């Protein structure tokens, strides 16, 4: 599982940070301290942490990930990381 996608809404200096979908690495999610939830309105589960994205990026560095690309879609900020 080399590719990872994480995101945050509206403002970046504060969480929550979405870090995974239903088929995400359970161990990696646990390492990040992420909880699984299904927000009302969404027809899918998500893993999230209350940490700002910066903190989550540093944690992913430790697990050997690198930011390949970052983009904004709407008011949501998204990061594409690769296991390098």
């Amino acid at each position: 599982m080399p590719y990872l996608l994480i995101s945050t809404q509206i403002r970046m200096e504060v969480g929550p940070t979405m870090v995974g979908d239903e088929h995400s690495d359970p161990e990696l999610m646990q390492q990040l301290g992420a909880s699984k939830r299904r927000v009302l309105g969404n027809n899918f589960y998500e893993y999230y942490v209350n940490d700002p994205p910066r903190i989550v990026l540093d944690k992913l560095e430790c697990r050997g990930f690198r930011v390949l690309s970052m983009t904004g879609v709407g008011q949501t900020l998204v990061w594409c990381l690769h296991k390098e």
């Binding site: 009302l40 309105g41 969404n42 027809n43 709407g74």
Partner: protein, 194 residues
């Protein structure tokens, strides 16, 4: 378990008794011509205003139909709604606007209105009423998104307290693509107008 017609018969006398007590406690004469049948009329009326307690969303929420051929926004606007605020037992009235984008399931247009009736005819809080309507639609259809807007006048804010006539309370719940997609939300908001 939901309230029943039997429950209403057994409790009617106590209600009537309570209202009769209220009349005396206010300084009125329950014997007075135009107040004689009031205790029963007031009781019966209050039972009608809260008839939603004798219904369960399950019934209505089971008449969903499979249909993945109608990818379009469905809106039922200007649904008259009358409810009682649980805080003062005074009614708040206005309209409800529902909209949704289906995935694979659809709901009959009248059924949407019934959802509004089951929850609005209870002692309520506008925010709760809004969410309950939206949640019901969500759980019955698993739609791409749903929107519910309620615009009402709370009599306890016009007839008393802050006494702001003209004042209105609008509550809005946007779920799924109605929340994520700006094009979607703006469309619903426009199509429910004037």
């Amino acid at each position: 378990r939901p309230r029943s017609e039997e429950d209403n018969e057994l409790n009617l006398p106590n209600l009537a008794a309570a209202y009769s007590s209220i009349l005396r406690s206010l300084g009125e004469d329950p014997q007075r011509q135009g107040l004689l049948k009031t205790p029963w009329r007031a009781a019966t009326a209050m039972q009608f205003f809260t008839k939603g307690y004798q219904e369960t969303i399950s019934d209505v929420l089971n008449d969903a139909i499979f249909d993945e051929d109608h990818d379009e926004m469905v809106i039922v606007k200007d649904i008259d709604m009358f409810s009682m605020c649980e805080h003062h037992l005074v009614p708040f009235v206005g309209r409800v606007h529902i909209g949704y984008l289906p995935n694979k399931q659809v709901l009959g247009l009248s059924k949407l209105a019934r959802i509004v009736e089951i929850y609005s005819r209870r002692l309520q809080v506008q925010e709760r009423l809004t969410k309950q309507i939206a949640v019901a639609i969500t759980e019955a259809l698993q739609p791409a998104g749903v929107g519910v807007v309620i615009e009402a006048t709370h009599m306890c804010m016009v007839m008393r307290g802050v006494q702001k006539m003209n004042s209105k309370t609008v509550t809005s719940t946007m779920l799924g693509v109605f929340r994520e997609d700006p094009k979607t939300r703006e469309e619903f908001l426009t199509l429910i107008r004037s």
